[PDB]
């Protein structure tokens, strides 16, 4: 069974594929050189920075550091709106609710704490505590003001109702620990990258693995959806970034250079999807052409590994966070 | 050049900055210890002296310590070890009963080699305890250590056997120029282990202080 099927899948995958997108885009002109500058430089942390998330209004962001502190910045003036003292000093993920009233963070405590920003007393308070994962939390994303999705190190993903705190749905099938996940723009589907060098697609409502993607040979650390919603890009830890087509269920192409050996820690697109920002352990973020596989530039300037990376919802600025305890808003 | 609300927000941000700067400076004056073991090795006794992550506090000689127990994490170590490359020392425990138990010594020194020779923990000294001393004495009085160490099992006596396991265990270290291995045999818990931990931490702090100058 297993095998005969696998075969059939692979044979269909090669039969439905004739050429990739390069051939097509021989005549597409390159985007050319890209010049960017550190238009701002946020500071105040005192330890490694592991996550950051832009706000809905494209003006606020939240960063998580090992010094048990959650900070919310007004990117326009580099102020500090709030400074939440974390219960557990170990945190490796953060999330901003679309409504702008809740924030979520995880860590090695296998607990996804949810905080409230708008309070009568004017102080942030722990709205609810979430438990049920037997492994360390890895990533979390807000669906609405009541639903939350988390991926942990026990190779499981679950959708939660924060009003009750129980596992509304559980996603299983990954044989390795899940690093990161990204939700589709329509909040219908999501793709998670695990340590088994595979990506799985799931449905938010019914909850079972709609498809599966392979091609990478090592752990996948980052994943993000294309703005169109029919494609996604994943970044492994062996200096290889690949683009996949959800509808085609095939890898489109790969982004690799002979001069990079480090892994990829963060991957994100642009508003139009023409740029594919990619983090690295070489202390500098390299930007790739989504249709040319050419390094149009690098956002160098960090003294340590770049951990998190994100783009504003309006497609106007790019923010990066590194272990040097510094956040830089690029433009 | 700024309206009233912006000035008030700037003042609030300055406050928040000062509060962090104070909290961080206060938190910097304490020692963080990582705890490791092969499972049921005796870490219970050490924590007895005074979910996922487990953290304990205890103050000794006007010094606030901090111990983390990560034995409850079943995930891959490489995914999260790197988040610990700031600890002052790493406490490693091992029981002297797995030589005739199946064998677990081999796994213990395998884990010790993996942790000690890891790239992240290159400038962190390791404190290594030896649990169940009297047990071990009874075991060697019962059966020799040929099972775990067929090559040079040695004379069945406390002096030879105790030294023998030590030399092997610290032989796995390879960055002998930078890292140090502090060893100590578990006594009857007569308020002596904490003294040894304090001495080792003071030595490590002295070396770190002299490193920068």
């Amino acid at each position, epitope marked *: 069974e297993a095998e005969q099927l696998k075969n059939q899948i692979r044979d269909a995958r090669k039969a439905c594929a004739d050429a990739t997108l390069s051939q097509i885009t021989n005549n597409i002109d390159p985007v050319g050189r890209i010049q960017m500058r550190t238009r701002r430089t946020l500071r105040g942390h005192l330890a490694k920075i592991y996550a950051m998330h832009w706000g809905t209004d494209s*003006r606020l962001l939240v960063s998580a550091s090992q010094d048990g502190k959650l900070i919310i910045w007004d990117s326009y003036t580099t102020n500090k709106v709030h400074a939440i003292p974390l219960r557990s000093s170990w945190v490796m993920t953060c999330a901003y609710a679309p409504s702008g009233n809740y924030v979520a963070c995880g860590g090695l405590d296998n607990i996804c704490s949810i905080y409230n920003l708008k309070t*009568r007393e*004017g102080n942030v308070r722990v709205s609810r505590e979430l438990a049920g994962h037997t492994g360390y939390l890895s990533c979390c994303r807000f669906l609405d003001d009541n639903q939350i999705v988390t991926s942990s190190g026990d190779t499981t993903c679950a959708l939660w109702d924060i009003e009750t705190g129980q596992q509304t749905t559980t996603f299983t099938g990954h044989t390795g620990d899940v690093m990161s996940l990204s939700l589709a723009p329509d909040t219908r589907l999501f793709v998670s990258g695990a340590c088994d060098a595979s990506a799985k697609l799931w449905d938010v409502r019914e909850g079972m693995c709609r498809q599966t993607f392979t091609g990478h040979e090592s752990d996948i650390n980052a994943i993000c959806f294309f703005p169109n919603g029919n494609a996604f890009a994943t970044g492994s830890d062996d200096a290889t970034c690949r683009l996949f087509d959800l509808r085609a269920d095939q890898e489109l192409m790969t982004y690799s250079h002979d001069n990079i050996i480090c892994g990829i820690t963060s991957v994100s697109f642009s508003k139009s999807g023409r740029l594919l920002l990619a983090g690295y352990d070489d202390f500098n973020c390299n930007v790739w052409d989504a249709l040319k596989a050419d390094r149009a530039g690098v956002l160098a300037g960090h003294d340590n590994r770049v951990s998190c990376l994100g783009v504003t919802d309006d497609g106007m600025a790019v923010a990066t966070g590194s272990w040097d305890s510094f956040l830089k808003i690029w433009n | 050049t700024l*309206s009233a*609300e*912006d000035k008030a927000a700037v*003042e*609030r941000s300055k406050m928040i900055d000062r509060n962090l700067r104070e909290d961080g400076e206060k938190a910097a004056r304490e020692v963080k210890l990582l705890l490791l073991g092969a499972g049921e090795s005796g870490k219970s006794t050490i924590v007895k002296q005074m979910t996922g992550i487990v953290e304990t506090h205890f103050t000794f000689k006007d010094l606030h310590f901090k111990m983390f127990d990560v034995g409850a994490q079943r995930s891959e170590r490489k995914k999260w070890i790197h988040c610990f490359e700031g600890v002052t020392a790493i406490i490693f425990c091992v029981a002297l009963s797995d030589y005739d138990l199946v064998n677990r010594m081999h796994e213990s020194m395998k884990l010790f080699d993996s942790i000690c020779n890891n790239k992240w923990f290159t400038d962190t000294s390791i404190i290594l305890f030896l649990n169940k001393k009297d047990l071990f004495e009874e075991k060697i009085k019962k059966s020799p250590l040929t099972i775990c160490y067929p090559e040079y099992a040695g004379s069945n006596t406390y002096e030879e056997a105790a030294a023998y396991i030590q030399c092997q265990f610290e032989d796995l270290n390879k960055r002998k120029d930078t890292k140090e291995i502090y060893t100590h045999f578990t006594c009857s818990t007569d308020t002596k282990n904490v003294q040894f931990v304090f001495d080792a931490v003071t030595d490590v702090i002295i070396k770190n202080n002299l490193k920068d100058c």
Partner: single-chain antibody, 199 residues
Framework: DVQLVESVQPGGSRKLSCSASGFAFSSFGMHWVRQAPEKGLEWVAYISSGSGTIYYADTVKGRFTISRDDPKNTLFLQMTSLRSEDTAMYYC??????????????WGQGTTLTVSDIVMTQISCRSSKSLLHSNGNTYLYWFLQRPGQSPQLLIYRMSNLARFSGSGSGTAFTLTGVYYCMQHLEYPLTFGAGTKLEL
């Protein structure tokens, strides 16, 4: 639940204490508003969070002193050398300032007592200087004082709601009890004339 509790021959001195409970008193800026018995309200004093900046109305400059007891969660408004033009009712008003915050969102029950400088004339009320800063923020607050208790904030920045609506532009603001419209550009605040709605 959040609430504020606060409790003279001419030329004397008096001490006014405002008691706060049910919220983080240390993180709020405390103001002080004097409500005239029949002549509206006027700004008097304000003490930033952390006992930093302090501002007084130029009428009672120097002769009035204000202070906060942060450990005791009290605000002290000490009055020295009172005059005849001081008989009025006083209000305890709190405020918190950050991006998207809501200043003047709560008011004290009020305690009675008996013994530059833009125009804020007065539904729509006008102004003397256009309150449109270069940052895109237009500072104007709409206040309603129903008869019987303290006023409450209705609309701030004429766009944010604390069925009510508000709009306008520079020097021309409108909103679509006695209604008060407030300015916040410059340190000395100025209250509206106060328009009475009845029947």
């Amino acid at each position: 639940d959040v609430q504020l509790v606060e409790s003279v021959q001419p030329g004397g001195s008096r001490k006014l204490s405002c008691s706060a409970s049910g919220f983080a008193f240390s993180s709020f800026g405390m103001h002080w508003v004097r409500q005239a018995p029949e002549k509206g309200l006027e700004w008097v004093a304000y003490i930033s969070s952390g006992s930093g900046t302090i501002y007084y109305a130029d009428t009672v400059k120097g002769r009035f002193t204000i202070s906060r007891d942060d450990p005791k969660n009290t605000l002290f408004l000490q009055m020295t050398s009172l005059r005849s033009e001081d008989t009025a009712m006083y209000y305890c008003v709190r405020s918190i300032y950050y991006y998207g915050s809501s200043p003047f969102d709560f008011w004290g029950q009020g305690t009675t007592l008996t013994v530059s400088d833009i125009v804020m004339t007065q539904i729509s009320c006008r102004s003397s200087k256009s309150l449109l800063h270069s940052n895109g923020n237009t500072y104007l607050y709409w206040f309603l004082q129903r008869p019987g208790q303290s006023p409450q904030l209705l609309i701030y920045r004429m766009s944010n709601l604390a069925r009510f609506s508000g709009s306008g532009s520079g020097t021309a603001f409108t909103l679509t009890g006695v209604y008060y419209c407030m300015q916040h550009l410059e340190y000395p605040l100025t209250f509206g004339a106060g328009t009475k709605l009845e029947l």
